[PDB]
Amino acid sequence: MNTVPFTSAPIEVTIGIDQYSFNVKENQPFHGIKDIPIGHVHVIHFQHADNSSMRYGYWFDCRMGNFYIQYDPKDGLYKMMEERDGAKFENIVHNFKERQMMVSYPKIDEDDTWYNLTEFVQMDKIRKIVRKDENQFSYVDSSMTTVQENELSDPAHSLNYTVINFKSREAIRPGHEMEDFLDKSYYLNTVMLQGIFKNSSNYFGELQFAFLNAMFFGNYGSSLQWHAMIELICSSATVPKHMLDKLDEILYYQIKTLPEQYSDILLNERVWNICLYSSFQKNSLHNTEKIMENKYPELL
Amino acid sequence: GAMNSSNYAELFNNDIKLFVDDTNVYRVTVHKTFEGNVATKAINGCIFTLNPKTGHLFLKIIHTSVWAGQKRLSQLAKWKTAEEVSALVRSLPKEEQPKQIIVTRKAMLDPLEVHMLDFPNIAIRPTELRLPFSAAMSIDKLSDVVMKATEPQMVLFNIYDDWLDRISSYTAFSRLTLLLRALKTNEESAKMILLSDPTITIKSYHLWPSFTDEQWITIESQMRDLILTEYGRKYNV
Numbered sequence: 001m002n003t004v005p006f007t008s009a010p011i012e013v014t015i016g017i018d019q020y021s022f023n024v025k026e027n028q029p030f031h032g033i034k035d036i037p038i039g040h041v042h043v044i045h046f047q048h049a050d051n052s053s054m055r056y057g058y059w060f061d062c063r064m065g066n067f068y069i070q071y072d073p074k075d076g077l078y079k080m081m082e083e084r085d086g087a088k089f090e091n092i093v094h095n096f097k098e099r100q101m102m103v104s105y106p107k108i109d110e111d112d113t114w115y116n117l118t119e120f121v122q123m124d125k126i127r128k129i130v131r132k133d134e135n136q137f138s139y140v141d142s143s144m145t146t147v148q149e150n151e152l153s154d155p156a157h158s159l160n161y162t163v164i165n166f167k168s169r170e171a172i173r174p175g176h177e178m179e180d181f182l183d184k185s186y187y188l189n190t191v192m193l194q195g196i197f198k199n200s201s202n203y204f205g206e207l208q209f210a211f212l213n214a215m216f217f218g219n220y221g222s223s224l225q226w227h228a229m230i231e232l233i234c235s236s237a238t239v240p241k242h243m244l245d246k247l248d249e250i251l252y253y254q255i256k257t258l259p260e261q262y263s264d265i266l267l268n269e270r271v272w273n274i275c276l277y278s279s280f281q282k283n284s285l286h287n288t289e290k291i292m293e294n295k296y297p298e299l300l
Numbered sequence: 301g302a303m304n305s306s307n308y309a310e311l312f313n314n315d316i317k318l319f320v321d322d323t324n325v326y327r328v329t330v331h332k333t334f335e336g337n338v339a340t341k342a343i344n345g346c347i348f349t350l351n352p353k354t355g356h357l358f359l360k361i362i363h364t365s366v367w368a369g370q371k372r373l374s375q376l377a378k379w380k381t382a383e384e385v386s387a388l389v390r391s392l393p394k395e396e397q398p399k400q401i402i403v404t405r406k407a408m409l410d411p412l413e414v415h416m417l418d419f420p421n422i423a424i425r426p427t428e429l430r431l432p433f434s435a436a437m438s439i440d441k442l443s444d445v446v447m448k449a450t451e452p453q454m455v456l457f458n459i460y461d462d463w464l465d466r467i468s469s470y471t472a473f474s475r476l477t478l479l480l481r482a483l484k485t486n487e488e489s490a491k492m493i494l495l496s497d498p499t500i501t502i503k504s505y506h507l508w509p510s511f512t513d514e515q516w517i518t519i520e521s522q523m524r525d526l527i528l529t530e531y532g533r534k535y536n537v
């Protein structure tokens with residue numbers, strides 16, 4: 001188990017760690033998060049009490065380094081930092097554990113939720129979507145735009161998701177206009193899976209990362225990307241039997257985890273009604289269809 | 301964006317544009333079968349592609365053989381229309397290619413957009429105008445070439461005959477849409493109006509009769525009366 005220590009907490013803030021969250025008061029003696037499960041990426045996220053503008057956060061993997069959070073009063077945010085001195089990093093953390101000034105990652109043992117939401121998400125792929133090569137961890141916030149959003153403006157602060165556009169030359173083979181527009185299998189299997197992502201696991205990883213950024217930061221372009229990646233699969237007549245089997249599990253846990261009161265803004269009615277009831281794969285998402293119908297029957 | 305009454309004069313400016321109407325592409329008769337089921341039989345159709353400034357009509361005849369062995373024909377017909385309009389654009393010299401293509405039915409937008417991806421600077425637009433181009437097959441010479449076709453064929457016409465020698469494009473389009481609306485509303489009566497007088501003839505090289513300026517005024521009034529008459533018959537007014 002690993003630990004993300006905080007030098008201090010000078011401003012009141014709601015802190016998230018994966019799907020968990022807790023409130024820290026202004027100047028409260030809080031010094032971080034312990035017992036973080038090794039083996040997964042994680043996200044530590046913030047929403048300031050005095051300014052809910054900019055949810056922001058950091059994706060990280062404790063296997064890649066020792067990371068700590070220090071509030072920067074000039075830039076006005078909690079920054080992640082890497083400690084290269086291992087012996088000092090152990091001692092300060094030790095001291096803060098001994099004084100019981102850390103919250104424990106509150107994982108229930110029966111509970112696979114975080115694994116189910118991040119099964120395909122790897123840090124190395126996050127660092128290609130979020131480009132800041134001098135850090136081993138990746139900053140995301142509520143306002144960052146995607147490369148596709150920018151094409152339709154600071155490129156260094158962008159989310160480089162894979163561009164999906166159903167009315168583009170990439171999606172449509174000359175001479176196969178109707179075929180490729182009504183059946184996106186070419187675009188899914190040849191252009192995206194064989195060509196760009198190389199395999200279904202990388203495709204799923206980006207889909208899962210997009211959802212998590214939409215959910216945790218309210219990042220609108222991330223929501224667009226998540227829905228586009230769902231729609232591309234569902235609008236394909238030919239998908240490797242197993243890949244729809246895996247889609248259903250991924251989407252089921254995403255819908256299960258979504259806050260009930262964010263469904264109006266995080267779920268696109270058109271995409272979901274099309275995917276569940278009209279698409280080639282309308283009968284391939286049994287678990288997702290059941291949870292959607294029982295939890296959000298209004299959207300449908 | 302969409303084309304309506306607010307930007308109606310844009311049709312007659314010097315930016316090349318084409319209307320595309322797909323109503324008459326897929327045409328069928330419906331009949332009972334020996335077993336008492338119902339079956340369709342396709343008949344030849346056409347794409348109606350019109351330059352409203354010049355009157356140039358690109359009439360692509362859609363021969364029934366293109367439907368043979370195909371499924372979902374009403375959907376296929378939109379894609380075939382888009383394929384053919386795209387082929388027409390590619391066939392035209394650069395300086396003749398349109399800057400806008402206006403489709404009369406919004407279901408043509410995506411098929412045409414996808415077929416025209418290679419032409420990102422040609423705007424594909426809907427219209428809020430209710431245009432009566434479905435009645436093109438009430439023009440005898442157009443109906444005749446479509447029904448006589450034994451293979452796919454493109455035939456070129458000027459749907460304004462020689463009117464632009466005497467009137468503006470705005471007026472010619474208004475006359476055309478009035479004639480087509482009248483033929484759409486009561487075809488028999490419209491043709492009666494257009495031919496009633498045997499001394500006014502259709503030139504071999506024209507579609508409509510050779511009316512004088514004064515006679516066109518009379519004809520247009522009679523067409524308006526027909527449309528109003530039929531509206532009264534319809535709604536009991």
Ligand SMILES: C[C@H](CC(=O)O)CC(=O)Nc1nccs1
Nearest residue numbers: 005006007068081083085089092
């Ligand atoms: C001041 C110090 C300067 C340095 O070590 O290069 C950096 C620092 O405090 N990092 C942390 N590690 C654990 C908790 S805080």
